[PDB]
Design a protein around this ligand. Sequence first.
Ligand SMILES: Nc1ccn([C@@H]2O[C@H](COP(=O)(O)OP(=O)(O)OP(=O)(O)O)[C@@H](O)[C@H]2O)c(=O)n1
Ligand SMILES: Nc1ccn([C@@H]2O[C@H](COP(=O)(O)OP(=O)(O)OP(=O)(O)O)[C@@H](O)[C@H]2O)c(=O)n1
Ligand SMILES: Nc1ccn([C@@H]2O[C@H](COP(=O)(O)OP(=O)(O)OP(=O)(O)O)[C@@H](O)[C@H]2O)c(=O)n1
Ligand SMILES: Nc1ccn([C@@H]2O[C@H](COP(=O)(O)OP(=O)(O)OP(=O)(O)O)[C@@H](O)[C@H]2O)c(=O)n1
Ligand SMILES: [Cl-]
Ligand SMILES: [Cl-]
Ligand SMILES: [Cl-]
Lengths: 247, 247, 62, 247
Amino acid sequence: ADVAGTSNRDFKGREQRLFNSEQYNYNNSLNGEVSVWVYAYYSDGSVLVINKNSQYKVGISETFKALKEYREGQHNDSYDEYEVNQSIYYPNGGDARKFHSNAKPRAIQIIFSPSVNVRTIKMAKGNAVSVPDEYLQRSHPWEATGIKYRKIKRDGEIVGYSHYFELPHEYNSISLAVSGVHKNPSSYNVGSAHNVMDVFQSCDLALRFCNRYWAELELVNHYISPNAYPYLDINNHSYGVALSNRQ
Amino acid sequence: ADVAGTSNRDFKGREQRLFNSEQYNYNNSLNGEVSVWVYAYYSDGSVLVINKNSQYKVGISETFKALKEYREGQHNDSYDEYEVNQSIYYPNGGDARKFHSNAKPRAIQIIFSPSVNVRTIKMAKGNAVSVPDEYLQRSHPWEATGIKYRKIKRDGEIVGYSHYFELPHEYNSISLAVSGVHKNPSSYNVGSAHNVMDVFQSCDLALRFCNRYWAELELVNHYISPNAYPYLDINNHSYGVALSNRQ
Amino acid sequence: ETFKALKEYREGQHNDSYDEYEVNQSIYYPNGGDARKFHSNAKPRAIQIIFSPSVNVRTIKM
Amino acid sequence: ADVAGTSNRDFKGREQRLFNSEQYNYNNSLNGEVSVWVYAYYSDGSVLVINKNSQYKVGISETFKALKEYREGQHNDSYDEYEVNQSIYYPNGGDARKFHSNAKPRAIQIIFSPSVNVRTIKMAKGNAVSVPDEYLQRSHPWEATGIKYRKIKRDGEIVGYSHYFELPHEYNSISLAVSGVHKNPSSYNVGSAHNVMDVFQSCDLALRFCNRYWAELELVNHYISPNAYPYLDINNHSYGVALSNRQ
Ligand SMILES: Nc1ccn([C@@H]2O[C@H](COP(=O)(O)OP(=O)(O)OP(=O)(O)O)[C@@H](O)[C@H]2O)c(=O)n1
Ligand SMILES: Nc1ccn([C@@H]2O[C@H](COP(=O)(O)OP(=O)(O)OP(=O)(O)O)[C@@H](O)[C@H]2O)c(=O)n1
Ligand SMILES: Nc1ccn([C@@H]2O[C@H](COP(=O)(O)OP(=O)(O)OP(=O)(O)O)[C@@H](O)[C@H]2O)c(=O)n1
Ligand SMILES: Nc1ccn([C@@H]2O[C@H](COP(=O)(O)OP(=O)(O)OP(=O)(O)O)[C@@H](O)[C@H]2O)c(=O)n1
Ligand SMILES: [Cl-]
Ligand SMILES: [Cl-]
Ligand SMILES: [Cl-]
């Protein structure tokens, strides 16, 4: 045989590069996934992640309450926290024994897979009673925030898109929904009559995941990295795996 | 009058047979329901059922965590089980005090109503972090598993369709979504522009049910049978009610 | 060992000890108990008996 | 064939009678079991049973403490009852909050299988510190109480032997061991050198059973009767199954 790494007859090398290329390109086809993650960061350094993976389009929608830190099989001040919610829904509406609940997120990061079209991204960041803009009568039900998403990059390739926002003030009390559509550079409308029922099925088939990790380190080691998910950490460091035309 | 059971002037007999026929045929019309059930079987002999009933199309989507046994108003090892999830999401990721959680399903049965079209059935059986096929980049977001569904039969009539799979190994750790479309032998697309908004409403109108029964006996007696639902038990015995052209 | 002594017991953890009393009553006599479960997971799924190589195998009794 | 119940050619009738005879006679052979039961009766109407089943010889030995009522998965005054034991072991030895513990047995019944030889029965009824007769220095370690055992009879056949004694006084505080030897009308000593090691194995092979039943009714219905065990109830009524030469 020829010698490895010296000619065009290195078939294991060419198959390696094609195997990686196919993965990148499959994800971007209309058969492939589009995924979104919402990361909510707590003052105790823990991170809630919510992930949804679906064909065609994907989204997540959470209430103010659902975004608050919840520690499984531990004490949570659950009564006092009911009271905190009443005080957040309406000023002086509750009887809590605290000024600031540490269960409230300090920051959100939204990340999309590189298969999204960034121009289709929509976000409904509501107040704590789930109203996008002060009052329903004047609310557009979303904002198109694609212009704010930063490319997460590895080796010069886009592995994901990130929008990061901090909630550092007492009045930063939110409900949150985000939505993105899978890339489609063709003129075949995946929602046209021919295929619209498959999109309806995709709503049922979307797989959800959610979990609270104790630290960003643990999130990176045991969630982001093992699954080849993209990420951007608090130090602005990029994670992901570049695959297009790469061994 | 003529004597019962001796002539074509037995109108109570003919109305009986028509009443049964109408029920069978209504369910199959575009006005009728399509229903799916997911049964998760636990080592303690109990069974979780999730049912969804809707027009046009129906589906269920559950996380790994949501499928685990939960005993209402009893002790559940909830802390230790948080740790079990961490160890299932990533090898050696947790600090649980057990090798195998008995809360994990030992088997799944998916059943559809006889109003589904079997060729439209789709299933997304993911790993424990809700990824259909190892990594998102190479995942088709579903499999069309209609070929595996067995007809549940009573008196020679199809009363339902069943796909049964056991999870008997330590690595059988899953998330699960299934979807089916109501039969439509016409050329009127229920998702075409004329009616697509009614399909969007059907997503909101779908009624869900879920409950943990202590035993398969209890499931058969108090869930399957009273509601005239189809079923297939561990002994391969069929339940349901045949209605087409029957008294 | 008795049937009861062979059942799983987790030291310093919860064991459903009341419900498991009821399970024993149902195992001793059909429909003899009022347990909230069909199958107790405390029941052994398998037994292995091992003797040292100093036994005479022909004397083993069970 | 001949007609049932009219001749000596009723083989199902003769096999029935032999099957019953064999059971009776097997039990009495040196290959058969000998069994003892200790019933301790509590003021709340519940009954503890301890059963041992073995070849050659059988016995039970319990401490004062082990004989006291214990309610599984319920409250038992366990601290106060430690104190009660201290007061029973030595007058004014404890700091209990009660004069009489209702956990103390009110009566004992000892029953042997009909395979025992009644003349071999021995009983060590000690005081609460497990001394047969006031002080060890003057204690014979047992009494031969066979003369007190009443035959439990069904249909004129001995199905068991019973010794019943009440503990109705404050000073009736006991430890208890009983022992009986399997009948052996032959001159082959089961304990002679030829077979003595089999007797040593029988000590290891003896199967034990113990359980607290809520009532004598429950004891009769769910313990005595299903297992064809002999019994004598508080009304002096006999239970058991006669088998010798019977259909
Ligand atoms: N604003 C108030 C008023 C009263 N309590 C009382 O204090 C007790 C404990 O408070 P809770 O908030 O329920 O905390 P934990 O029980 O410690 O935590 P968890 O409920 O999550 O186990 C409760 O019985 C509750 O009735 C309270 O927590 N907060
Ligand atoms: N791997 C570990 C480590 C510690 N614990 C501790 O043991 C106690 C009981 O365990 P848990 O799993 O919470 O079981 P239960 O309290 O019995 O059940 P439930 O929470 O469902 O009432 C908890 O306080 C928990 O802190 C545990 O269960 N598992
Ligand atoms: N069949 C029944 C009926 C009632 N209970 C009640 O439910 C409570 C908890 O049940 P148990 O079986 O005792 O479980 P745990 O207390 O959680 O476990 P452990 O006793 O081993 O600490 C008890 O107070 C018991 O009275 C029960 O467990 N099982
Ligand atoms: N002579 C005494 C002195 C003190 N106590 C105290 O009272 C409490 C309850 O008594 P206990 O006898 O332990 O009864 P329970 O806890 O109700 O029953 P169990 O221990 O069987 O659950 C205990 O904390 C014990 O310290 C007692 O029972 N008896
Ligand atoms: Cl495509
Ligand atoms: Cl129709
Ligand atoms: Cl013999």
